Amino acid sequence: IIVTPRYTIIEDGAINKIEEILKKLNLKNPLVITGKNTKKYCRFFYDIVYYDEILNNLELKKYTAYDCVIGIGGGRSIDTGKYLAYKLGIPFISVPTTASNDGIASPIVSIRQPSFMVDAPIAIIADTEIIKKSPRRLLSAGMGDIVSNITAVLDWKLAYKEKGEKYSESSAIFSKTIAKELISYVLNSDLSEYHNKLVKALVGSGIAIAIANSSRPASGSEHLFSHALDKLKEEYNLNINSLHGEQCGIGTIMMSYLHEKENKKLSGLHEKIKMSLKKVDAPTTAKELGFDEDIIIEALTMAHKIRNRWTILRDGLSREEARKLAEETGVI
Amino acid sequence: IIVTPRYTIIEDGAINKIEEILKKLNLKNPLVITGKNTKKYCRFFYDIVYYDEILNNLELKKYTAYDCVIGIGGGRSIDTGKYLAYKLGIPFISVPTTASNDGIASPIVSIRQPSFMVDAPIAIIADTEIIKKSPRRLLSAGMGDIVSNITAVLDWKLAYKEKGEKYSESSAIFSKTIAKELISYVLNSDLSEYHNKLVKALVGSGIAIAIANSSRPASGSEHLFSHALDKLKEEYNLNINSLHGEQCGIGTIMMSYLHEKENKKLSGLHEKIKMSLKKVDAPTTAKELGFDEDIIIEALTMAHKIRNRWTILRDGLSREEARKLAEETGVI
């Protein structure tokens, strides 16, 4: 069984179409989940809750009256609403106020690792006028999440070839081509439609996940690396507000380089990815990202263990190989 | 808006999931539309109506009570139910009993030309046990409807290039790769999962249409050719039981060859397509299809006029060109 969105809207002023969509879906009493910084975009009568409240106290019969959940804001607002909808057995509507990650339209819940699959949101309502004005850092981070499809798909193919893992060529090429087109737009344009093209790309990626019934087309080694970084932040109680997308971008730079070494046909791939990220002002080094080199290296060595998913990392990098990789790609 | 299916089920015994799916969609009063040969698969107590009977006297408050339409059967049952759902402003559930064309999951209504866009079905319930047993000719025809994505996409790229028509690389490559995968499966395997792979491909193709908001990834000059054939059958009152997919398959052979003349990198594409069609016993010649060579030639010369859609046919083939084309590809 494949669950996809029913409705997808990407346009200026889309936020005003919430009610139209609810009506189309025969829904009447949403619970809105949002953030403190995004509450200003919530202009309607519906009940509103902040994702903090929910998160501190998951478990509930408190939510009995709602026939759906609307997640408005950033990745965490969305992710939290998605999870909540799942727990309540009701549809989820995704209303991103930025373009920072591919959770927007994905069936993936990433509240706490390990992440799991639920239903894709029933609707995606992406107001590009709001998104255009979101903090630049979040838009830049979104690029990180998109370029990662490239290594995710490379890693998927690899897992197919070397471990006979189940693979779909048509899903993979869809996911990959989304990334390719955005890279090529970023490298050849004035960027005046970047926010638009980025949100379309992120939504496309979520659909790819749904259709493949797997995060494989959107998540591979580069994501393992990012999760490792997250683990280490928590562990060492580091105070670094690096974004998910940013970490994935840097991850992709390095993992694309590993794939390049083994396959001369991909010559210049890692450079092109790095360039695309620089062009939109996403970080490409550990220093810009806020991390000491030892954390990057530790994250690399542990990345293959984060999940049971074969990638170009294979059975793992040594500290020495990790250091080399990170040096050669300019991450440190 | 992009409107896509919500639920997609492709598996043995899927027909028994209708109740479950209706419940998930909070739908409770369907009208079932079916055919005389497929009524036997309607094992439920819903109201049932035959498409032919609805088709003659179309235009209605007879149906005010239903909250959805379920189309069960072949292309025409589905196409009729889809149309009806659209007229009533209610969701359509698609329940194919064969795999004969891409109307299964598409937002296209093709009752009579010109065909138009509506909503994608809200659910696709494809029982591969039923479909496996459908008349072999219909399964063979389905291949015709799949390979046509290749020329459709070639024609789309050409319209982008030459007329600046709106184009999506990621949708196009998805649609095209679906066809490639299935061709490759057909040429490499024992065909024991062909029905299953075919249904998945046809559904994928419908999703591609939805996502592109256009029939472009799935319908080009080859489909024009097929419509022209249909026009001529009606006009000369020919009694030829040729299927839509069959006609598209042969169309594809010829249109590929036109693309080949201008782009040598594609050379041999049309022969591979021909081979794939032969491997599943779809017709590849006018004689197998049931037509006289003059009808083929006339259809070719009129195809570009069937709709306002720029293709490799451009402003049209002369009868002499048409004959050469059909001769050079072995169609006549």
Ligand SMILES: NC(=O)C1=CN([C@@H]2O[C@H](COP(=O)(O)OP(=O)(O)OC[C@H]3O[C@@H](n4cnc5c(N)ncnc54)[C@H](OP(=O)(O)O)[C@@H]3O)[C@@H](O)[C@H]2O)C=CC1
């Ligand atoms: N594999 C993974 O880990 C994935 C995880 N996710 C989920 O996404 C999260 C990351 O999301 P991300 O967006 O990167 O980070 P956050 O959701 O933490 O967002 C960062 C900040 O940006 C703010 N913000 C968002 N939009 C606007 C706007 N228009 N104007 C002003 N501020 C805005 C948010 O405000 P506020 O405080 O109001 O929220 C938040 O404070 C993860 O933690 C996870 O829950 C999603 C995809 C993949």
Ligand SMILES: NC(=O)C1=CN([C@@H]2O[C@H](COP(=O)(O)OP(=O)(O)OC[C@H]3O[C@@H](n4cnc5c(N)ncnc54)[C@H](OP(=O)(O)O)[C@@H]3O)[C@@H](O)[C@H]2O)C=CC1
């Ligand atoms: N581009 C286009 O123009 C497109 C058009 N269409 C629409 O679809 C139609 C073509 O559909 P297609 O399926 O090729 O042709 P039809 O639906 O006309 O015919 C299929 C025939 O097979 C029978 N049948 C189907 N499944 C079974 C089964 N499991 N067992 C026994 N018999 C079965 C049907 O029965 P029954 O007689 O009971 O119906 C029908 O007689 C077109 O006429 C058009 O309306 C669809 C997609 C694209």
Ligand SMILES: [K+]
């Ligand atoms: K991604």
Ligand SMILES: [K+]
């Ligand atoms: K097609």
Ligand SMILES: [Zn+2]
């Ligand atoms: Zn991600």
Ligand SMILES: [Zn+2]
């Ligand atoms: Zn067709």
